[PDB]
Design a protein around this ligand. Structure first.
Ligand SMILES: OC[C@H]1O[C@@H](O[C@H]2[C@H](O)[C@@H](O)[C@H](O)O[C@@H]2CO)[C@H](O)[C@@H](O)[C@H]1O
Ligand SMILES: OC[C@H]1O[C@@H](O[C@H]2[C@H](O)[C@@H](O)[C@H](O)O[C@@H]2CO)[C@H](O)[C@@H](O)[C@H]1O
Ligand SMILES: OC[C@H]1O[C@@H](O[C@H]2[C@H](O)[C@@H](O)[C@H](O)O[C@@H]2CO)[C@H](O)[C@@H](O)[C@H]1O
Ligand SMILES: OC[C@H]1O[C@@H](O[C@H]2[C@H](O)[C@@H](O)[C@H](O)O[C@@H]2CO)[C@H](O)[C@@H](O)[C@H]1O
Ligand SMILES: OC[C@H]1O[C@@H](O[C@H]2[C@H](O)[C@@H](O)[C@H](O)O[C@@H]2CO)[C@H](O)[C@@H](O)[C@H]1O
Ligand SMILES: OC[C@H]1O[C@@H](O[C@H]2[C@H](O)[C@@H](O)[C@H](O)O[C@@H]2CO)[C@H](O)[C@@H](O)[C@H]1O
Ligand SMILES: OC[C@H]1O[C@@H](O[C@H]2[C@H](O)[C@@H](O)[C@H](O)O[C@@H]2CO)[C@H](O)[C@@H](O)[C@H]1O
Ligand SMILES: OC[C@H]1O[C@@H](O[C@H]2[C@H](O)[C@@H](O)[C@H](O)O[C@@H]2CO)[C@H](O)[C@@H](O)[C@H]1O
Ligand SMILES: OC[C@H]1O[C@@H](O[C@H]2[C@H](O)[C@@H](O)[C@H](O)O[C@@H]2CO)[C@H](O)[C@@H](O)[C@H]1O
Ligand SMILES: OC[C@H]1O[C@@H](O[C@H]2[C@H](O)[C@@H](O)[C@H](O)O[C@@H]2CO)[C@H](O)[C@@H](O)[C@H]1O
Ligand SMILES: [Ca+2]
Ligand SMILES: [Ca+2]
Ligand SMILES: [Ca+2]
Ligand SMILES: [Ca+2]
Ligand SMILES: [Ca+2]
Ligand SMILES: [Ca+2]
Ligand SMILES: [Ca+2]
Ligand SMILES: [Ca+2]
Ligand SMILES: [Ca+2]
Ligand SMILES: [Ca+2]
Ligand SMILES: [Cl-]
Ligand SMILES: [Cl-]
Ligand code: NA
Ligand code: NA
Ligand code: NA
Ligand code: NA
Ligand code: NA
Ligand code: NA
Ligand code: NA
Ligand code: NA
Ligand code: NA
Ligand code: NA
Lengths: 135, 135, 135, 135, 135, 135, 135, 135, 135, 135
């Protein structure tokens, strides 16, 4: 009804992991250009993080990390979602975010954590990615 | 429509009884692989038990017991649903759960009770099963 | 399109008259086996009665009365709907229900009242019937 | 979606102009038998008159007037809608309704006014007609 | 799904930029004649401007401006939407509207502003256009 | 609180039986002049009839009938509520309304029916009355 | 409660007729300074005209007309409400508005019509006035 | 806001235990006559039972049992609430209901269970009671 | 009455201008200490801007600008509301914000724009201010 | 209004910090005795922690830690809220909970963290406390 068969429906939106590897920026443009009304995913509750993590664990083969829509463009710990939603929830991995070497401003789901925790990472890294769309 | 023709729409979700016999664990992952977001069914009110019980008695094939999403992971009688909803409702059959022979940590609907009551059973045993999805 | 094109959409559900003549219980089992989530129809509002009456008058030829889902299972004047919804609405015909000779425990729409009012009738009578479904 | 592609969705219902010419009675019965849950159209606010008027102009060419669901069944200026909705809104053309020569009891949208205003007319006149359905 | 796959679902409606050059009036008629209930788009919220601006930037390349449904038919700065919705939100570009040379009465989204802001333009100019439909 | 302590809160409105005897018109004017936005009560649901019937039985002793806001001003059975709400629910007593002797045009709740059913009565008769107000 | 006892609650706002005589400008400023969130009244549906008309008749005796919030600020028949709401509804008296002798730019409810219909009048005329507030 | 200080607010309603002792019938009439829109309490979810039980334990001194609105007038296990709500939830004590000596048709909260479980009891018994009101 | 009589009710909250002149931070602490749940005002809709502008123009004498709750805490152009609501709406004045000489990090309504548009200003400036509260 | 003047309204409930020092248990029963339905506060999202933290820092008296409704009854680290809401959120301070000296099974907001983080503490120790009510 709300979403096509191969998309995860949650709180009015539809989510899908893509196994293809891309930079954070390339992943966002792809989601946006996939169908009108799409972006890399934004998270707003713990239940979402867990339902999403399990979904990726079941539908994604490999240990590659997954890009999500959070980023720090101003480069000063002001994380914002590409979909323009509120940053009213977080779940950083242990010791994150750390702006490692001052080159990490794009967020990724950490494979080692069952895709449940976030990590700021180099945007030029090649990760799989999670799109979020309205249908 | 809210659900495909052969699914039971109920309080916003869709349910279906599958007659193929599987272990509790394979019944779960089967549901999750039918479509992203599905799980073995969870119950939260008396009306659902009755509705579900009637649906199964009308649509199943055979006289098998049915696996649902409730399971005792810690083995300390701490029942949790695979869909992560709160365990705010329970409807055990007479004298259950009994962790019989300390080898029962999975819940099934009991066929002899017309599929209304629950019973903790051996997870490696095979049963028919009830999936729950959001479309 | 909440319903197939040959069903009447009404307050979240779908309705359809079946002109084949059946006993009250055979009608209920036919609705039940039609598709999951169906029963003989339940009524909860004055507006539903008038809408259903006209629908029946237009799609139901002849003057056979029509079975709906109300019945007195305990034979004690406690009317219940087969869909388990609340009995919070009643529109009995003149001098009904009367449990005539204590042999009438099933409810039908009365052809003579333009299918607006109800009558308790011998359950084994053959009437056309109104199914209700969730799609 | 709320309506088929060939229909106009407005405030919860679906509307379609039919260009076949019919008497008011035949137009009402055609709508009723088109599919369950339909009637000639009722109007309740100025926006609806304006939206319908433009819709007909775009999808109904020619100078034929259009039947709608208002009629004077008691013949004493008691205008009621066939869909049983409230007569809480009227938009009569200049000097209407007038029961001209006591032969006018059905209401049509007047082509010369761009289908904005109403006229009471001989029910046996052949006009195009506007149906309203629930899907 | 609320909209066809190549349309943008937004607050109950569906939007689509058509990359064809037309005068303001031809663009309105094209939308109106597409399916019943469409018009050049109306805007009522800041979030809509941002969402539309981004969508247009991604699905409409080049520098052609885009027609929207606002127009000053009376020519005394009384801006009205073709879909008759209320003019309760405005987002004019710097120093607009200005009725430049008494020849500008139709509104367009300005490419140079990233399609975020509005400008009144000569109605016979050729722009791409944004349709809005209710499905 | 939605209503003063001696008024019955029901579906957004406040109701109160006044145990004073008045003609139908004096009863309407009394309610109207009580506070801005009051009228003799209008009814739209079966649940309201039951709730009101019980309330009146408990707070109005004796056998005097009770005026409600339904009246046939035109005298051709066109029943309208004084609060201008839609006449979309009726619950006439046996064989009513009958315009007995061409002198009955105002409606009252019938004491002998437990204030559940309606009757058209001579407007100059003295009944207690039921006011409805928006606070 | 939604409004004080001395005010009429209608569709979310509160209305009160003031019997003091004032020019249209003084009436608008009195409403604004009465308390934050008030203006002379705006109308958007026929029900409101009818409810307001009766309210004024009951709580405003005498033959004085009543100021409401509609006015032609540009002086070219561009009627706008002081509360910035949409002019989506009009109910002018016979042959109004007429800009009689080019001195009429403010709108009053006409006493001779029972306060149902409107007239454009000399803004400096002393009329009673209707305020609208949020509480 | 919703309820007076000494009442427990839950799901739109207000609840209060009265320490005075009365028969079931006398307790119901008292609630009804206390203020318009009151009855002995009805329960519809487990959380209600527990929040209520705790409230009574804290505000009620003594070990006397508490009457609630459930009863079996037809005397055949058809329990219904005096407030006319659905019987979509139950929580009988161990081995209840038992229609002991065929003289128990009124329900009471069992003090020994911390007022959490129900017991069918003699209606002529003197218990404290829980009223439920709308304000 | 969602608010005290000297406050402006608006979309669930209450607003009030304070004419005393304070630095941006002293204004925020004054709103905070006024009553629990108060801050300098946040804006989220075009309609709020216009309503607040008129309210200020009527209850605020003089031309002192007015502090609102937006500020750039990280001094990096990342504007946040003191009430922690989402920055999903902006209405900057011409050529603002400009961080003039890198000393302006607090936002005020501009008197010259009729209090409609915003300007980033030196936080130590003395302005009147707008509080917002939940009552 | 939703709450009394000296209470903090937040997501439908009312909160207040009490400075009187009490044991965790007496703080709980004190809240329950302030009004039926109250309990020590429960948290379910990051925004509440921040809102509450700020409120307390502004309205308390002293530098005491604050008791909240979370407590480990079974002493097996199974935290439950006194208001019976699900424990779907947690925000422990550094290295907590530690069941230190196996004598800590009650949670307090830590003053040195600006009242944002939690810590399990000795239940017999005294602290300021945060009540939560529904009015
Ligand atoms: O060194 C900081 C760096 O950590 C990376 O993640 C580490 C992780 O913290 C560590 O526990 C694991 O063993 O190896 C990972 C990969 O080196 C992050 O990817 C990076 O963003 C920084 O946070
Ligand atoms: O012995 C515990 C065991 O009981 C099984 O159920 C029994 C049931 O108790 C008995 O009354 C019936 O006749 O036979 C059933 C099947 O042996 C449960 O299936 C099992 O899970 C345990 O609970
Ligand atoms: O007499 C009890 C019996 O009545 C039937 O209804 C009658 C009805 O009263 C009469 O008006 C009509 O002409 O004939 C009907 C059929 O004989 C009911 O159908 C039956 O259920 C009983 O209630
Ligand atoms: O004479 C009453 C008659 O009017 C018809 O309408 C007229 C209309 O008023 C006039 O402006 C136009 O030029 O000619 C129409 C047709 O003669 C109505 O159609 C008819 O119903 C009567 O009301
Ligand atoms: O001069 C009025 C005219 O402005 C056009 O916009 C111009 C703008 O004036 C100029 O400064 C900028 O460099 O180029 C813009 C695009 O041509 C408007 O497009 C036109 O409608 C008038 O308003
Ligand atoms: O006869 C018409 C008349 O009926 C009154 O009701 C009577 C009823 O006719 C009678 O059978 C019963 O015993 O007493 C009723 C109460 O007087 C209506 O009240 C009146 O309005 C007319 O409809
Ligand atoms: O002549 C235009 C003039 O009309 C006034 O209203 C008239 C009204 O039309 C008439 O029916 C009544 O008897 O006398 C009124 C007052 O002369 C309007 O008040 C005025 O504004 C003009 O429109
Ligand atoms: O004897 C059945 C009878 O039980 C009463 O309750 C008992 C309860 O079951 C028992 O465990 C306790 O020791 O004493 C109670 C009082 O005798 C019920 O009150 C009655 O309704 C029956 O169910
Ligand atoms: O020049 C930057 C400076 O501008 C101030 O605003 C000016 C405004 O540009 C001008 O139109 C008006 O006449 O005078 C204002 C005050 O000098 C802003 O107030 C200031 O914050 C900076 O943005
Ligand atoms: O030792 C465990 C104990 O810690 C207390 O908190 C300490 C805190 O760890 C330390 O950093 C700070 O300087 O002093 C605090 C007070 O001693 C907790 O209060 C207590 O509950 C335990 O967790
Ligand atoms: Ca990192
Ligand atoms: Ca078992
Ligand atoms: Ca019968
Ligand atoms: Ca005519
Ligand atoms: Ca221009
Ligand atoms: Ca009568
Ligand atoms: Ca005039
Ligand atoms: Ca018993
Ligand atoms: Ca500036
Ligand atoms: Ca600790
Ligand atoms: Cl009803
Ligand atoms: Cl907006
Ligand atoms: Na999301
Ligand atoms: Na479930
Ligand atoms: Na039904
Ligand atoms: Na209609
Ligand atoms: Na739009
Ligand atoms: Na009413
Ligand atoms: Na208004
Ligand atoms: Na209840
Ligand atoms: Na705000
Ligand atoms: Na809470």
């Amino acid at each position: 009804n709300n979403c096509p068969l191969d998309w995860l429906p949650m709180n009015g939106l539809c989510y899908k992991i893509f196994n293809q590897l891309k930079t954070w920026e390339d992943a966002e443009m792809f989601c946006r250009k996939y169908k009108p009304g799409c972006h890399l995913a934004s998270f707003h509750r713990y239940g979402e993080s867990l339902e999403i993590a399990e979904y990726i664990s079941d539908y994604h083969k490999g240990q590659e990390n997954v890009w999500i829509g959070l980023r720090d463009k101003k480069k000063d710990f002001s994380w914002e979602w590409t979909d323009r939603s509120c940053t009213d929830y977080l779940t950083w991995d242990k010791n994150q975010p750390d702006h490692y070497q001052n080159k990490e401003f794009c967020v990724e789901l950490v494979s080692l954590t069952g895709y449940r925790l976030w990590n700021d990472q180099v945007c030029e890294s090649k990760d799989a990615f999670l799109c979020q769309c309205k249908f």
